[PDB]
Amino acid sequence: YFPDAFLTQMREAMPFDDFLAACQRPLRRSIRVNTLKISVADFLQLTAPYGWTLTPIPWCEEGFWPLGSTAEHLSGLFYIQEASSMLPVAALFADGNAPQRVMDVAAAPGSKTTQISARMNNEGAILANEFSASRVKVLHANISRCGISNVALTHFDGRVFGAAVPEMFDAILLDAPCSGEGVVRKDPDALKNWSPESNQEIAATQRELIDSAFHALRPGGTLVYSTCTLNQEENEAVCLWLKETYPDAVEFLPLGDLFPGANKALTEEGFLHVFPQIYDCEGFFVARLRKTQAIPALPAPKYKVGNFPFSPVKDREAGQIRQAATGVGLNWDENLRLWQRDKELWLFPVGIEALIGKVRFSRLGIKLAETHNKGYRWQHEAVIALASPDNMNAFELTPQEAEEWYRGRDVYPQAAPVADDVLVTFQHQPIGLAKRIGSRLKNSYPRELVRDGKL
Q1: Is residue 132 located within the same domain as residue 249?
Q2: Is residue 111 part of an annotated ligand binding site?
Q3: How many domains does the chain contain in total?
Q4: Closest alpha carbon to 215 in 305, 364, 103
Q5: Of 147, 99, 111, whose CA–CA distance to 32 is shortest?
Q6: Residue 110 is assigned to a ligand binding site
Q7: Domain boundary among 257, 291, 325
Q8: Residue 406 in contact with residue 349, Cβ under 8 Å?
Q9: Where in the sequence numbering do the catalytic residues fall?
Q10: Where along the chain is the active site annotated?
Q11: Any known ligand binding at 109?
């Protein structure tokens, strides 16, 4: 369903029928491989038995066309995400762009965040901001599932960043809340409350969003602006505005070589204005800019953000934890350093350090452990992230035994390893960390996730 005003002005902005057609047909199931865990080729090899046809996505070598309840999804080897969300992320790293400190402004539900992480090879650091509180917990679950460690979370109104955190990021991805015209294929009533007035104010929001972003972008950095909507007010008009506001500071960086076929969607400015029927998918806009120059300062550091509840772990102790963890299969890069709050023990990415005190964080990095007596309760989240499977104390489950784990039940091996603490893999992926207890392997899969159904 489509309002008259909207169609009879999509008619006057087409460079059409095919579009009405593609508009009205449902989206293709779409999947993205997580190379933090498995290579593409390996993935293809591994899921060949399931007999799916998979069309390659042109702007994402890692992208392809009951999903959530498949082993591979549970061990975090792929993300269920739409091809259009892949595009902004691809732009962000186009032409060997290799940013080390990145913000995702509207990060839930995690689709893009996870993808950026994988592309940075889990190095550097990311600030994933999400405005809605409820969506934050979704974001976090999704991050923890993919074993991402370079992410910190905030809960802010996006507009704040420009003033709060000046030339902080070397890349930003601003996927702006829009009028969702491109999303009628996922939701046949999506727009229904659509109106040109309602759009003028949405565009007003998108202005101050992108200004905030630009402000928080270090000189030299790239910013990618994307929406799910197809009109010019919210897209080209918003980018063009930014350039008018900072004429000597903003450079559009054409996206035409982004992939083969990109030309089909290329705007005179170098944006990709992807109509749904062009590549058979969602309706989407992608714009990439670079800040070429420092721009004037804002006041506006009003929010004095008070004590940070964690302290960096001292060297004597940090060493002993590193060795205690290694002894159980967990390992970290030089990208990560150990902090502490209570019995709690966290790893933060050094990339994020510089932000401490300029923003209140919802969460940072990963909880490695909680101290208990002389010991440690290793967190599931850290096992997914830091566990090396190719080990001599790994233990591979049978499919039968794997299903049991995910239904949150104890497992009884014929083998029956020697370790009192056993790193449990399936398809040779870290799946959880279990205690021995004689012959039994106790289930330590967090209950908030114990699968209810079929597998």
Answers
A1: yes
A2: yes
A3: 2
A4: 103
A5: 111
A6: yes
A7: 291
A8: no
A9: 228
A10: 228 (nucleophile)
A11: yes
